[PDB]
Amino acid sequence: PTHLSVDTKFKTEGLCVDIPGIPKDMTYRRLISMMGFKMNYQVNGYPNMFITREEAIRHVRAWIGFDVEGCHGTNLPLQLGFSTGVNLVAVPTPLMYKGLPWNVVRIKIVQMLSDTLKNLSDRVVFVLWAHGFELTSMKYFVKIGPERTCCLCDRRATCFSTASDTYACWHHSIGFDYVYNPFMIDVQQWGFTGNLQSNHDLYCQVHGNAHVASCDAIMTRCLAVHECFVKRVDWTIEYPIIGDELKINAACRKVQHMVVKAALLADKFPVLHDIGNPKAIKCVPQADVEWKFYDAQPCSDKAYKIEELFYSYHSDKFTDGVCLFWNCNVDRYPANSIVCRFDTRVLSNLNLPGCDGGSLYVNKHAFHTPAFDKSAFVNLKQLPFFYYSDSPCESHGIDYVPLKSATCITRCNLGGAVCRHHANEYRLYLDAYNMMISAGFSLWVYKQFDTYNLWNTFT
């Protein structure tokens, strides 16, 4: 079982207010046909418009919450809502647009999905809390058939144009009018009691219900993210490389070694308490310090309470030496800490919107992270940028412009003139540092940390 069989049963109770008299016994095959689609027994890579929960999790970057509400067999106007916050009104003749015929609405839909998804995914997954109008509106903006490739490139076709009779991916679909071979999943099929708002509001106080289609579409995708990434966590699942993942990760390791190495040199802590990933390795293996590890998995729901991580009886006295919380999200860090906390508010292709203020950070694996809280860092300060090196000044070998910086903490800078080697390493480190900060990571340190203490490690 790789795909969802079209012969799987579909619970239709959620659909019977918009579709009165709908059979209780219904398959995906019969539902697809009822929606106005003919699959014709085609095995060309598109076996079902509906997908499994596991396949949906593998394609989280493609999720677009979708909801349709009736406004007025005589067709009436529909409010189409998307988790992008867009509301389009289609007439059959937060951003909400006036009523226009489907021929122009479908151009808008293709533009919106293409701009939203071109840098995230090779497809779209419509996430539903299916009541009827959304499934029956799909025929007006969706075309299906064999799996195809783009006319302008090698990516899979996600759009279709009736003007040119051609296919395109999200990058080459300017002016296209039809969504081609989309995927969809109905959250209501997962076994739930009560309406969408009641289930969403159990875990999220951030998304309100301003009684608009996009509000429901947003709540839908949010509840789906909570079920698949907050309550259930799967760190085995791999995700494709779509950006700067490798550079961001390489930067993180360089910044960690640099910042921890300098803390141990400036304040000579006898012991370091490394709290976080159970698979963590010594980030400064040559350091003199007594390195003690504590296992805590990435918290995906609420940030850890320091009272449960530290107290209840390890040195036991965590007040001795320094605490290293490298991506270990706690509610209030102790004053003797070195902290890297991901800022969930960051705008990027790796960071997807999440549940209750949190975000879904997708870099090789999916990590639902709790909402960034400035109050977690009251006992600390923002760690300033600095580069430190004790390596010999020796070129061994891009051209050269002389480096003048107060933050290049090297023997050559102490001696009044930065050597070529330390200037190259400084600029490479600053690049890695800016790369990590812009990816969303934030660095915090114990208030007594001072890089002035690093000059005397040169004599």
Ligand SMILES: CCN(CC)c1cc(C)nc2ncnn12
């Ligand atoms: C009351 C019949 N009507 C309205 C025309 C329906 C019913 C269904 C199941 N799908 C539909 N798709 C579009 N109209 N539509």
Ligand SMILES: CCN(CC)c1cc(C)nc2ncnn12
């Ligand atoms: C209420 C029945 N249905 C299907 C759920 C309808 C009715 C009307 C008037 N327009 C529609 N456009 C799409 N579906 N649809």
Ligand SMILES: [Zn+2]
């Ligand atoms: Zn293309």
Ligand SMILES: [Zn+2]
């Ligand atoms: Zn929510």
Ligand SMILES: [Zn+2]
């Ligand atoms: Zn030097």
